[PDB]
């Protein structure tokens, strides 16, 4: 029973609830009082748990969600693709993480990931996103976006605990939505590639997309590489050594050498992209 779960009671104090629907592969948040899309930075587009539950029913939505802010104490930790078919932990780093950080844990909507909610603060020296080789991922946020709430409790972990989160340094990569602005810009211009199907020449699809990235990122080869890794054209081959470098690095360099134009926020030259949309 969702409302008897202690973690849900603590979150039900805040009027920061939304509902969500699945679109293709993405989960878009909606305003639970009028069924319109919701900003994750505007407070009055959200509701309390009761309004979100009434909105869930009213609009046939897929589930509830909770919007994180910098003033509330909650930290959202997303462990993606870390569960097997019998809902047990297959990844070692996840097993390590759940030993070190014990707090409210639930299974994701898809059923192959975990969410962890903690009362605390993120250290300022770690990246929000960390990919692993096998396919799993660690995402961490305390503000700016929403989080889906299923209520499907993992391992009886039903309560949000006040914890130190220094131990995320063992798992997350350290640092010393601007890439996401480019990704979001590319998606609404039709410049985001499809995942490859039966007939496709993947290596040729890489180069077409690498040419596009060179324009939109403006020949910043590291940003191109960081965006490429999030795209559906990513594979192990990207990091396979080739000659003195990798297949990926050689692909990104040739694209930078090839393309004549570069995207400029100042001049506003969206149309100057010489390649037509997908």
Q: For every residue of the chain, which 3-state class applies, written as one string?
A: CHHHCHHHHHHCCCCCEEEEEEECCEEEEECCCCCCECCCCCHHHCECHHHHHHHHHHHCCCEEEEECCCCCCEEEEEEECCECCCCCECCHHHHHHHHHCCCEEEECCCCCCEEEEEECCCCCCECCEEECCCCCEEEEECCCCEEEECCCECCCCCCCCECCCCHHHHCCCECCCHHHHHHHHHHHCCCCCCCCCCCCCHHHHHHHHHHHHHHHHCCCHHHHHHHHCCCCCCCHHHHCEECCEEHHHHHHHHHHHHCCCCCCCCCCCCCCCCCCCC
Which residues have a Cβ under 8 Å from the Cβ of 76 and sit 6 or more positions away?
68, 115, 116, 117, 139, 140, 141, 142, 147
d(CA 177, CA 185): 12
Residue pair 65/149 in contact (Cβ under 8 Å)? The answer is yes
Experimental method, per PDB record: X-ray
- Tell whether residue 115 is among the known ligand binding residues: yes
Which of 85, 268, 76, 72 lies closest to 185, judged by CA?
268
d(CA 208, CA 249): 15
- Tell whether residue 50 is among the known ligand binding residues: no
Q: Indicate which residues carry an active-site annotation.
A: 78, 80, 115, 139
d(CA 25, CA 123): 30
- Tell whether residue 264 is among the known ligand binding residues: no
Residue pair 77/42 in contact (Cβ under 8 Å)? The answer is no
Which of 271, 266, 196, 239 lies closest to 209, judged by CA?
196
Residue pair 229/238 in contact (Cβ under 8 Å)? The answer is yes
């Amino acid at each position: 029973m969702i409302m008897e779960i202690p973690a849900i009671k603590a979150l039900s104090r805040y009027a920061q609830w939304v509902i969500w629907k699945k679109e293709r592969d993405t989960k878009i948040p909606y305003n639970p009082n009028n069924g319109k899309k919701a900003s994750s930075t505007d407070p009055l587009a959200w509701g309390d748990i009761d309004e979100a539950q009434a909105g869930l029913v009213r609009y046939g939505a897929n589930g509830l969600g909770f919007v994180l802010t910098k003033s509330d104490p909650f930290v959202f930790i997303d462990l993606d693709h870390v569960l097997d078919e019998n809902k047990r932990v297959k990844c070692e780093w996840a097993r390590q993480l759940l030993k070190e950080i014990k707090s409210y844990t639930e299974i994701s909507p898809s059923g192959d990931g975990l969410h962890v909610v903690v009362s605390g603060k993120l250290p300022d020296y770690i990246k929000h996103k960390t990919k692993f080789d096998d396919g799993s991922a660690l995402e961490v946020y305390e503000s700016g976006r929403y989080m889906t709430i299923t209520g499907e409790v993992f391992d009886g972990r039903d309560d949000i605990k006040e914890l130190d989160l220094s131990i995320l340094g063992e798992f997350a990569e350290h640092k010393i939505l601007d890439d996401e602005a480019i990704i979001d810009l590319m998606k609404r211009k039709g410049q985001w590639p499809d995942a490859p199907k039966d007939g496709d020449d993947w290596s040729s699809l890489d180069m077409s997309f690498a040419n596009r990235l060179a324009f939109w990122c403006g020949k910043d080869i590291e940003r191109m590489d960081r965006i490429f890794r999030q795209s559906p054209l990513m594979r192990q081959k990207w990091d396979r050594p080739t000659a003195g470098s990798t297949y990926g690095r050689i692909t990104l360099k040739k694209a930078c050498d090839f393309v004549d134009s570069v995207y400029d926020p100042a001049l506003r030259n969206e149309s100057d992209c010489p390649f037509e949309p997908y």
